[PDB]
Amino acid sequence: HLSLLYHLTAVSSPAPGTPAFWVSGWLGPQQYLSYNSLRGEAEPCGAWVWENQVSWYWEKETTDLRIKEKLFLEAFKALGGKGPYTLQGLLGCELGPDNTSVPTAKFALNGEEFMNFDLKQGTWGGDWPEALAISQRWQQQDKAANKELTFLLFSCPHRLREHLERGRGNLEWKEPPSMRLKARPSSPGFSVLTCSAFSFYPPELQLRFLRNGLAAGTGQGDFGPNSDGSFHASSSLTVKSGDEHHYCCIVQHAGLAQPLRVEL
Amino acid sequence: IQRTPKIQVYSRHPAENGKSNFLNCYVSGFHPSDIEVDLLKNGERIEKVEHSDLSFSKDWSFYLLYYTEFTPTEKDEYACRVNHVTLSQPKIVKWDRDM
Amino acid sequence: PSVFLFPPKPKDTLYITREPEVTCVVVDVPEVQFNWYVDGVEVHNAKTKPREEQFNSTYRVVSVLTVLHQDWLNGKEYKCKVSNPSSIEKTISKAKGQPREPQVYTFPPEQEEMTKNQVSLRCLVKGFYPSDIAVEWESNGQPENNYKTTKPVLDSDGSFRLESRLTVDKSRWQEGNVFSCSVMHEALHNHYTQKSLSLS
Ligand SMILES: *[C@@H]1O[C@H](CO[C@@H]2O[C@@H](C)[C@@H](O)[C@@H](O)[C@@H]2O)[C@@H](O[C@@H]2O[C@H](CO)[C@@H](O[C@@H]3O[C@H](CO[C@H]4O[C@H](CO)[C@@H](O)[C@H](O)[C@@H]4O[C@@H]4O[C@H](CO)[C@@H](O[C@@H]5O[C@H](CO)[C@H](O)[C@H](O)[C@H]5O)[C@H](O)[C@H]4NC(C)=O)[C@@H](O)[C@H](O[C@H]4O[C@H](CO)[C@@H](O)[C@H](O)[C@@H]4O[C@@H]4O[C@H](CO)[C@@H](O)[C@H](O)[C@H]4NC(C)=O)[C@@H]3O)[C@H](O)[C@H]2NC(C)=O)[C@H](O)[C@H]1NC(C)=O
């Protein structure tokens, strides 16, 4: 069930030569879109740079994200208050079985969720005094609630369907990991067994350990992106030094037809 | 709230000496968004370093990738140095090849 | 040495841009180390100040843990373990139970008290749960300081209650200024309500 989600961020005091407002756009786990207040232009990212796309798509992403730039910076004026502020927004949609769109519209102030847009009602609201202040400022600004409604109920679902038709490739891309399994001495009597998966897509991957073909646990896992939208992971298990060769590492991944056993 | 950055250092492809590769420093789970990241070669900073867009996770905490094209060797040691308001002193994490 | 665990100021729990903190104080101390736990799970974001000397030649050590607003509201427990014979644990949290909306009533001074330099405006707040609350006053929308408020006291129906008294100059009242009792509670719409009062 693939999703188009904008991650928007405004700060009341940007560090020198960084933007007061910037947006990353995501089709599932890939970034397709970048926008910031300094350049003022929505742009395709990586593979989406040569998506079979219409001539005005990027101009219309730019138009919408500039209105959000102005809106997010108005919100600070409604707080007055004290300290510096971070307003974040998670706005988008996901397709539902019977050609229906399920929307998301949440906001966070200094790192904590406080506000949402109700798509049934066309109103901002939350449990918090700051949600009342920002909703009231926004709701009163001419056509703010309507463009928010439109962005989520019209633009996000059309954009999502166009990306499925025009960029199907980008989303079906399957790069299985390159694997390593190394053992390092840690404490006297003990070694750390690290199973590493390199340069894989999509991100869903399961690393677990066997000892003489019996489940020896998942180990302790880390996860991260690469520069090219591929991913990296490792899982470490502490083991009896002199026992390393009895252990192997198993990896499940959408790219691999059957699970892959990696030996030391 | 305020949140201290988690720091991972890994190569894009398995670490082969002599072979051209990419060194990644993934900084994640931090708030606020103002953060400084240096990639070090032999405890000295690399000038030709790029980064992904400052983004954030479902829990609203930010993340950021710093990466450089490099060619590793037996002798050369790499690290990531990070400074954030939540840190009293810079935090340095060495690239261990295992991971 | 002995410990005292202090909860966040209610007002800090109710405004998402304020910093609610649990303050764990160690008294009668040579070095102290703190551990903090949130519903069992340990966290590492606490901030310890330097020890300081008192009149009575003992050291006082203070460690503060900032807390997620919604975590404090969902009744999670904050445990501060002090290491120095054994370790001494203390735990704090918000009371469990069905949250209830404060009822607010304002009372003008009864002509009889009127013959004075100053008059007292009265605010009654009752039917609320839990006891975590903040009360303030405003004249024509701008804060006042010259007031006093009793501690939340449990009532016969299992809800809490409280009174606030704003002392003002007789003239300021008789010129027909709008005065407001402001109440901050988790169960209120956007955590805030206002009852206003002006000479009729
Ligand atoms: C040697 O010296 C020191 C220093 O005394 C200092 O020296 C000079 C300055 C003198 O002026 C002197 O008076 C000073 O004391 C002595 O240290 C003292 O030790 C005693 C214990 O012997 C401590 O007494 C306890 O006090 C608790 C309340 O303390 C607060 O209130 C007073 C003012 O009334 C202040 O002085 C304190 O600092 C505390 O103030 C609070 O501070 C919090 C933390 O900073 C604040 O919260 C934070 O605030 C910040 C910013 O402001 C943020 O907002 C944060 O979010 C927030 O967390 C808070 O605002 C502030 N409150 C107020 C009102 O000001 C008592 O509660 C406690 O009694 C309970 O427990 C006893 C047993 O353990 C029991 O016998 C009591 O009956 C009582 O029991 C409780 O009762 C209630 C009733 O409903 C129940 O609900 C409870 O469940 C129940 N609890 C228990 C456990 O049973 C103590 O009496 C004192 O704190 C400490 N002082 C200091 C400053 O640290 C030392 O003892 C001296 N030795 C001597 C003289 O022999």
Residue numbers in the entry:
A (entry chain A): 4 to 267
B (entry chain B): 1 to 99
C (entry chain H): 238 to 266, 271 to 325, 329 to 444
Paper text:
Here we report a structure-guided approach to engineer monomeric Fc molecules to adapt multiple versions of half-life extension modifications. The pH-dependent Fc–FcRn interaction is a key contributor to the prolonged serum half-life of antibodies and their derivatives. Past efforts to engineer a monomeric Fc, defined as one set of CH2 and CH3 domains, have proved challenging due to the extensive interactions to be disrupted in the CH3–CH3 dimer interface. Monomeric Fc molecules would provide a quick and robust method for achieving structural insight at the Fc–FcRn interface.
Using recombinant FcRn binding analysis, we found that MFc3 did not differ significantly from MFc1, showing an equilibrium dissociation constant (KD) of approximately 300 nM. This finding suggested that the S354E substitution did not alter the interaction with FcRn. To confirm this mode of binding, the MFc3/FcRn complex was prepared at low pH and was subsequently purified and crystallized, and diffraction data were collected to a resolution of 2.6 Å. a MFc3 (orange) and FcRn (blue)/β2-macroglobulin (pink) complex were crystallized in the C2221 space group with cell parameters a = 68.10 Å, b = 122.10 Å, c = 179.45 Å, Matthews parameter VM = 2.87 Å3/Da, solvent content of 57.2%, and one complex per asymmetric part of the unit cell. b Binding interface between MFc3 (orange) and FcRn (blue). Comparison of the two interfaces showed that the mode of interaction remained nearly identical, having minor differences that most likely arose from the difference in resolving the side chains in the electron density maps. This structural and functional invariance of the Fc–FcRn interaction was expected because the S354E mutation is more than 20 Å away from the FcRn interface. The overall structures of the MFc4/FcRn and MFc3/FcRn complexes superimpose with an RMSD of 0.35 Å over 3700 non-hydrogen atoms, suggesting a high degree of similarity. Now, with the help of MFc3 and MFc4 structural complexes with FcRn, with their two distal sets of mutations, we were able to gain a better understanding between wild-type binding interfaces and their mutation sets. For example, at the wild-type interface around residues 252, 254, and 256, where the YTE (M252Y/S254T/T256E) mutations reside, the interface solvation energy map showed that Met252 had an only moderate contribution to the FcRn interface, whereas Thr256 was not actually involved. The most significant FcRn interaction from the 252–254–256 loop was provided by Ser254.
